[PDB]
Amino acid sequence: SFTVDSARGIFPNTLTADVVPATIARFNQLNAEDQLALIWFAYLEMGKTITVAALGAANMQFAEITMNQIRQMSFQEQTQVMCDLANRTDTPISRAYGSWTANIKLGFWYQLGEWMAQGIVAPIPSGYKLSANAASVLQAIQGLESGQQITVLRNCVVDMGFDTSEPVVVPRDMAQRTQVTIEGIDNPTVLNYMNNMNANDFEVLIELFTPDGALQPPFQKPIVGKDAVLRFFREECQNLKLIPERGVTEPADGGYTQIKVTGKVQTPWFGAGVGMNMAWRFLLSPENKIFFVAIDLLASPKELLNLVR
Amino acid sequence: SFTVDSARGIFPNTLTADVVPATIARFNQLNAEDQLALIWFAYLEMGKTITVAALGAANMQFAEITMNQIRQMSFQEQTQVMCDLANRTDTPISRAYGSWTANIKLGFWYQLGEWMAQGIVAPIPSGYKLSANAASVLQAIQGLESGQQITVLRNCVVDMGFDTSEPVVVPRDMAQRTQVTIEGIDNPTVLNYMNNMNANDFEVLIELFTPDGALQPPFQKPIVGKDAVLRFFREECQNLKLIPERGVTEPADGGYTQIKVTGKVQTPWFGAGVGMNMAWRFLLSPENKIFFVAIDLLASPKELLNLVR
Ligand SMILES: CC1=C(/C=C/C(C)=C/C=C/C(C)=C/C=C/C=C(C)/C=C/C=C(C)/C=C/C2=C(C)C(=O)CCC2(C)C)C(C)(C)CCC1=O
Ligand SMILES: CC1=C(/C=C/C(C)=C/C=C/C(C)=C/C=C/C=C(C)/C=C/C=C(C)/C=C/C2=C(C)C(=O)CCC2(C)C)C(C)(C)CCC1=O
After folding, report:
1. Ligand 1: does its nearest atom lie under 6 Å from the Cβ of A110?
2. Same domain for B278 and B223
3. Which of B74, B114, B239 sits opposite A120 (nearest CB)?
4. FRET pair for B249, CA 20 to 30 Å: which of A58, A219, A280, B204?
C-alpha cells in the first residue's frame, strides 16, 4: 500500500541537479582554511545579492551576542573560531552554532561576511593560496547556475558547527493571498499546498497531509509525520515564493494518484534575483491527502518541460 | 573664557551642505502619502547600497516583534501604520517607534523596505502620484551627492514617530587598531579622538573631553557634557570609519587652541560605497582637552582643501 521508501521513486526520469550534492561532498573533504577562503571567493561574486528578507523572522538576539563576542576578538582568535566552525570542532561557540536553525546560521555568516568586507572582523589572509583541490571545487561552484550555486553555499554553511529561540511565523492576510495556476492540474490538494506555502499558512497546509505523510527536500532524506513536517515548515519555509508552471497526473496502484509539477521557486534570501527550477512529485492517498511529496532541484531549465513517463 | 555658544562659530568660512537641512524642511511639509512614496522612489535608486554592518549591534528583537505584527496586517492596515509614523501620530506603534534609537529606526525601515520589494508587506500604490511639491523635493534629493542624499534620508526616517534595548558596544582588539595620519596635525588629542572613534573605544575617547565639553553633529545642536556625549557615542557612533586628510592649528584667546581638520567619513550603513566629505572644528582648552568639537558635512569636495581663515 505504498511506503515512503517506495513513494520516493515516483517519476524517476526527473533529472535532478546532483552536481550540487557532489560538489558539497568535494567541499567537505577540504581543510578548514580552504573552506573559509573558497566560500569567501564564491561569496565575493554573489554576496551583494543576499537580502535581509529572511531575517526579522528568525530571531537573532542571542546569536548576535556571540557575533559581537567574535567581533571583539583578535584576528587570530576570530580566525580560530571560524576554523572551529568549519572543522565542526567541539567548542562552546561551535556547539551553540550547531544548535541553531538554518536561518540563524545563515544570518550569522551573513553579518560576519559584511563585517569582514568593512574590516570589522578578520578578512581572508591576503596572500593565502587555495590548495589545488580547493581551487577545483571553487571553479566547479563558479560554473553552476545561480540556483545551484546558492544551494551549495547554504548546505555548506548549515552543516558547520558541532552537531548535538523560536522564529515568528506570520500567515499572510487573506486580502493579499494569491492563487497559483498550474497548466494541466486543478487538484485542490496540489493547488492549496502551493497557496498555503505562499501564505505561510502552515497549520492549514499540514492538514493536507496524511498523519504519516512525508516531505523530502532537495537532496535530503524524507521528513516523516505531521509533527516533523510542520516543524520543518515553521523553522525553514517562511516567505518562499512557489511559482508552479505545469504538471501531469498519473493513476497509481491502490487508488493512489501521482502528480508531477514543475516550476520556479524563490527564497527570501535572494528574492527575485534567483529563480530555482524545481519539480514537486506528489503521491496522494485515496482520500486525496498528501502521503508523500518530494521537492527536486532540477538539473537545468529543460527539465521544466519534462512531463513524460 | 569661551562658551559653547561662542565656540560653535570657529572657522566660520567652512562651507557646509546646508541644502541637506533645507531639503529636510521641504520634506517635512509634505503629506504622509507623499513622504512614503518619495522616500521609496529615492530608495529605489540607492536601496541596494545599504549594508547590514550597522545591525547585529543595535539589538532588534523587540522592534522585530512589531515588524512581524505589521507583516501580518492587511495592506490597508500596513499603509495606515506607515502613515501614522510619517505623520508622527500618537498611536501605540508610533510611540514605540519614537522611543527607539536611530539605528533601530533605520533597521526597522530597512527590513520593511526589503519586505516591500518582495511583496511581503504593502508596496507603494502603483498609480499614486507624487504631488507637485513632493515631485520637486524628490528631484532635489536625486540631484545631491550620495553623502548628502543618505543624510537627508536618515534624518527624515529618524524624525518619524511620536516623540515622547541597549546596543552592544564592542571596542576593537588592540592588535587591529589603526592610527590616522593628518597632514599638518600631530596634536595627540586630535589624533586620539580619531583613533578611539575608529576603535569604538568610547570610554577612552570621552576622557579627552572637558567635563563640560560639547560635541555638535552635522546640522544639530551641541550635545553638552560627558554623560550626554558618551551616550551619543554608544547609541549612534559605532563602526564609523574616520579618514582625516589634513588640518590647520590656530591660536585662540585665553590659551585655547582651535584646529580644523578635513577628510572623509564612512558609515557602516553603506561602508565604502559612500564617502562623506567632513570637517572637524575643535576648540581645545589650555590643558589640551576638547571643550568643543563640531562635525560638519561639507558642501562639496572643494571644501576639503579650504583651510584658510
Ligand atoms: C560561510 C562563510 C561566509 C558566509 C557566507 C554566506 C553568508 C552564505 C549564505 C548563503 C545563503 C544566504 C544561502 C541561501 C540559500 C537558500 C536556498 C538555496 C533556499 C532554497 C529553498 C527552497 C528550494 C525551498 C524549497 C521548498 C519547496 C518549494 C516546498 O514545496 C516545500 C518546502 C521546501 C523548503 C522544500 C563568509 C563570506 C563570511 C566567508 C567565510 C565563510 O566560511
Ligand atoms: C522610510 C521609508 C523607507 C525606508 C527607507 C530606508 C531603509 C532608509 C535608510 C536610510 C539609511 C540607512 C540612512 C543612513 C544614513 C547614515 C548616515 C548619513 C551616517 C552619518 C554619520 C556620520 C557623518 C558620522 C559622524 C560622526 C563623526 C565623524 C565624529 O567625529 C563624531 C560622531 C559623529 C556621529 C558626529 C521605504 C523604502 C520602506 C519606503 C517607505 C518609507 O517611508
Report:
1. yes
2. yes
3. B239
4. B204
What does residue A86 show for φ and ψ, rounded to 5 degrees? -60, -40
When CB atoms are compared, the residue of A64, A239, A271 closest to B59 is: A64
Residues 177-236 in A contacting B (C-alpha not used; CB under 8 Å): none
Elucidation method: X-ray
User: Are residues B130 and B21 both part of a single domain?
Assistant: yes
The CB of A191 under 6 Å from ligand 1? The reply is no
Answer yes or no: do A120 and B268 touch at CB < 8 A.
yes
A113 is in which domain, residue-wise? Answer: 17-164
Q: Return the residue in B74, B80, B114 with the most chain A beta carbons within 10 A, the one to mutate for interface testing.
A: B114
- Tell me: do A227 and A133 sit in the same domain: no
Last residue of a domain, one of B95, B130, B164: B164
- Pairwise CB contact (< 8 Å): A114 & B72: no
Domain ends where: B132, B164, B196? B164
Cβ–Cβ below 8 Å for A68 and B171: no
- Give DSSP secondary structure letters for chain A: ---HHHHTTSSTT--B-THHHHHHHHHTTS-HHHHHHHHHHHHHTTGGG--STTTTTS--HHHHHHHHHHHTS-HHHHHHHHHHHHHT---HHHHHHHHS-HHHHHHHHHHHHHHHHTTSS----TTPPPPHHHHHHHHHHHTS-HHHHHHHHHHHHHT-S----PPP--PPPGGG-----BBTB--HHHHHHHHHHHTT-HHHHHTTEEEEEEEE-TTSPPEESHHHHHHHHHHH-TT-EEEEEEEEEEE-GGG-EEEEEEEEEE-TTTGGG--EEEEEEEEE-TTS-EEEEEEEEBSSGGGGG----
A137 and A187, same domain (yes or no): no
Q: Tell me which residue has cell 568643543.
A: B292
For residue A239, the chain B residue with the least C-alpha distance is B120
Resolution in A: 1.9
Ligand lying nearest the CA atom of residue A217: 1
Q: Which of B31, B38, B109 to mutate to test the pocket of ligand 2 (most atoms within 8 A of CB)?
A: B109
Q: Does residue A99 lie in a domain region?
A: yes
Residue B98 lies in a domain: yes
Contact A217 CB / ligand 1 (< 6 Å): yes
Give the count of domains, chain A.
2
How far is ligand 1, taken at its centre, from the CA of residue A247, in Å? 26
Ligand 1 atom showing the smallest separation from residue A113 Cα: 38
Kindly state whether residue A9 falls inside one of the protein's structural domains.
no
Do B266 and B129 belong to one domain?
A: no
Residue whose CA lies nearest to ligand 1 atom number 11: A154
Judgement on whether residues B228 and B259 belong to the same structural domain of the protein:
yes
Could you tell me if B243 lies within 8 Å of chain A, comparing CB atoms?
no
B152 and B213 in a common domain: no
Q: Could you tell me if residue A171 is inside a domain?
A: no
